[PDB]
Each structure stands twice: as structure tokens, then as C-alpha cells.
Amino acid sequence: PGRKTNQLQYMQNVVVKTLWKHQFAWPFYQPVDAIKLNLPDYHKIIKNPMDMGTIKKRLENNYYWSASECMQDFNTMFTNCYIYNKPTDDIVLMAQALEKIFLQKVAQMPQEEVEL
Amino acid sequence: PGRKTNQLQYMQNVVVKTLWKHQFAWPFYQPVDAIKLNLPDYHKIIKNPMDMGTIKKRLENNYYWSASECMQDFNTMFTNCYIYNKPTDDIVLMAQALEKIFLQKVAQMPQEEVEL
């Protein structure tokens, strides 16, 4: 049961918008294709895949009841990357840089969630 | 095997140093590994592989006799990428940007090659 809230509008028009523009965001635009990319254990490890394109479409179609759910999807996206990849891989550093911006934006979000 | 020349020193400390720091250079730091990257037709199509890491190592180990060899290795690297990939692939647009900077620095290289 979705919902439109001040916070979900902020997730869509500030958080996703800002991250999409970042030069490190492109590995996260689409779901990880483990066969195309030769990642044969990916779905054995990552059972809850998530990507920013999915998050964007979920916001655009009022999938979420609360911005907390959208923040959880972002956390799943980042942590899936942290788990699957090795602690020193470039993609982990890219994810960490995007998560830093994500947390900076979340900190400026309206702290009270109200339906529109 | 090789020697020091003013043009090779320029290739190392101007051309390669600049290109190595460029935002688009990272796909060219290492030989294309057609096994790890799942490129089963790469060596069918590309018979003379080259990459910037190999070029940089060759300069550091005084492998080259003349800068003409180093410039041709860059040409082979870039040309291979255009032969293998689609003109719409992002890697080809990255190669284009890098090749323009390469030719810019080449134009300002010392025009007469002397041994150092």
C-alpha cells in the first residue's frame, strides 16, 4: 500500500536525482546481470538484489509507504556491493563515495514524514 | 633492448603521466583478460593486444629504442578498442577522449629525437 509523502518526494527529487548525476553511479543504474558479467556466485550470495534504477521506478510509481522503506532499499544496494565484492575493489570505494553523499542528503531531509 | 631519448622521456613524464591520471584511463591500465572478462571472441579479432600499463612498464624498463615505438603502441591500443567494440560503447568514447589528449601532447613533443 503505497503513499506519497514529503520525505518520499525528497528521496525522488533530491536523493536519486543527485546520486544519478554522480560519475560513480553508473554501475548501479541497472540490476547486476551475473551471467553477462561473469559473476557465477552472485545470486548465491546476493539474494535481495537492488539497484538505483529499481529504486527510481519504485518512487515514480508510489511503491513505498514511507521513505524509510526507500532508505532500506538504498542500504541494500550499497551493502550488496560491500558484501559481494572484495574489501579493496574500486567498486566498493565508488559505493562508499555514493553512500557518503546519500547520507549527506538524508541528513537534510524533512525529519517529519507527512502524506501530501 | 632500448635506450633513453628526449622523446621517450617526454612520453613517460608528460604523455603517460597525464593519461594515467585521466578519469577515463582505467579500462586501459591492464591487458584485456578475455577469460576473466568473458570475451570469447577478443583474441579472434585482436591479434596485437596493447594496454597503457604495458606501455608504462616498457618506458620504465627502457624497453623502447625510439619514441616512434611508444606512439605506435598507443595507436595499436586505441585502434584495437575501436575494432573490437561498437561505436556506441562508452569504452570507445573514453578511448576517443584519451586519444585526443595523447595527440595534443604528441604535437608538443620535441621534434628531433636524441639519445640521453
mmCIF file of C-alpha atoms in Angstrom, chain A residues 22-100:
data_model
loop_
_atom_site.group_PDB
_atom_site.id
_atom_site.type_symbol
_atom_site.label_atom_id
_atom_site.label_comp_id
_atom_site.label_asym_id
_atom_site.label_seq_id
_atom_site.Cartn_x
_atom_site.Cartn_y
_atom_site.Cartn_z
ATOM 1 C CA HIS A 22 27.488 11.308 -9.929
ATOM 2 C CA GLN A 23 30.292 9.917 -12.095
ATOM 3 C CA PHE A 24 30.410 6.781 -9.878
ATOM 4 C CA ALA A 25 26.698 5.950 -10.124
ATOM 5 C CA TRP A 26 26.610 4.063 -13.452
ATOM 6 C CA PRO A 27 27.283 0.503 -12.128
ATOM 7 C CA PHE A 28 24.109 0.964 -10.073
ATOM 8 C CA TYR A 29 21.733 2.143 -12.796
ATOM 9 C CA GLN A 30 20.537 -1.379 -13.659
ATOM 10 C CA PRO A 31 20.282 -4.738 -11.884
ATOM 11 C CA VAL A 32 23.528 -6.697 -11.770
ATOM 12 C CA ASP A 33 23.459 -9.216 -14.658
ATOM 13 C CA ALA A 34 25.530 -12.043 -13.187
ATOM 14 C CA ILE A 35 25.628 -14.101 -16.391
ATOM 15 C CA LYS A 36 26.580 -11.248 -18.741
ATOM 16 C CA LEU A 37 29.266 -10.042 -16.325
ATOM 17 C CA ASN A 38 30.724 -13.475 -15.392
ATOM 18 C CA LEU A 39 29.712 -13.410 -11.705
ATOM 19 C CA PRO A 40 28.682 -17.056 -11.240
ATOM 20 C CA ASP A 41 28.183 -16.985 -7.423
ATOM 21 C CA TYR A 42 26.420 -13.609 -7.342
ATOM 22 C CA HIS A 43 22.861 -14.808 -6.739
ATOM 23 C CA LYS A 44 24.126 -17.460 -4.314
ATOM 24 C CA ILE A 45 25.417 -14.600 -2.134
ATOM 25 C CA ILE A 46 23.082 -11.743 -3.064
ATOM 26 C CA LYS A 47 19.520 -12.941 -2.527
ATOM 27 C CA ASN A 48 17.938 -9.459 -2.314
ATOM 28 C CA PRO A 49 19.311 -7.622 -5.365
ATOM 29 C CA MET A 50 18.694 -3.897 -5.601
ATOM 30 C CA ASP A 51 19.791 -1.080 -7.903
ATOM 31 C CA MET A 52 19.103 2.624 -8.271
ATOM 32 C CA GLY A 53 17.003 2.185 -11.418
ATOM 33 C CA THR A 54 14.632 -0.051 -9.492
ATOM 34 C CA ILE A 55 14.552 2.449 -6.610
ATOM 35 C CA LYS A 56 13.811 5.281 -9.049
ATOM 36 C CA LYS A 57 10.924 3.410 -10.676
ATOM 37 C CA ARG A 58 9.562 2.484 -7.243
ATOM 38 C CA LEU A 59 9.463 6.159 -6.268
ATOM 39 C CA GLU A 60 7.993 7.140 -9.650
ATOM 40 C CA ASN A 61 5.138 4.636 -9.170
ATOM 41 C CA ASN A 62 4.446 5.349 -5.468
ATOM 42 C CA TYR A 63 5.595 1.871 -4.455
ATOM 43 C CA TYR A 64 6.676 2.949 -0.972
ATOM 44 C CA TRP A 65 4.553 3.682 2.059
ATOM 45 C CA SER A 66 7.415 5.548 3.764
ATOM 46 C CA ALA A 67 10.825 6.972 2.913
ATOM 47 C CA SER A 68 12.234 4.552 5.496
ATOM 48 C CA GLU A 69 11.489 1.739 3.042
ATOM 49 C CA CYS A 70 13.248 3.629 0.273
ATOM 50 C CA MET A 71 16.275 4.227 2.512
ATOM 51 C CA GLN A 72 16.315 0.480 3.251
ATOM 52 C CA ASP A 73 16.494 -0.257 -0.486
ATOM 53 C CA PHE A 74 19.445 2.133 -0.806
ATOM 54 C CA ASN A 75 21.120 0.375 2.112
ATOM 55 C CA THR A 76 20.529 -2.982 0.442
ATOM 56 C CA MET A 77 22.042 -1.665 -2.785
ATOM 57 C CA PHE A 78 25.183 -0.369 -1.062
ATOM 58 C CA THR A 79 25.660 -3.325 1.288
ATOM 59 C CA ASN A 80 25.098 -5.883 -1.507
ATOM 60 C CA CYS A 81 28.065 -4.240 -3.197
ATOM 61 C CA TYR A 82 30.087 -4.232 0.056
ATOM 62 C CA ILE A 83 29.448 -7.965 0.602
ATOM 63 C CA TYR A 84 29.868 -9.411 -2.861
ATOM 64 C CA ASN A 85 32.999 -7.521 -3.794
ATOM 65 C CA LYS A 86 36.316 -7.623 -2.095
ATOM 66 C CA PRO A 87 37.133 -5.069 0.606
ATOM 67 C CA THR A 88 39.616 -3.166 -1.628
ATOM 68 C CA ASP A 89 37.856 -3.269 -5.017
ATOM 69 C CA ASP A 90 37.271 0.011 -6.842
ATOM 70 C CA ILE A 91 33.526 -0.605 -6.967
ATOM 71 C CA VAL A 92 33.458 -0.726 -3.145
ATOM 72 C CA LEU A 93 35.196 2.657 -2.955
ATOM 73 C CA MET A 94 32.713 4.003 -5.512
ATOM 74 C CA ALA A 95 29.808 2.674 -3.463
ATOM 75 C CA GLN A 96 31.298 4.212 -0.315
ATOM 76 C CA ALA A 97 31.549 7.598 -2.029
ATOM 77 C CA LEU A 98 27.930 7.393 -3.181
ATOM 78 C CA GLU A 99 26.809 6.305 0.281
ATOM 79 C CA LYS A 100 28.584 9.316 1.774
#
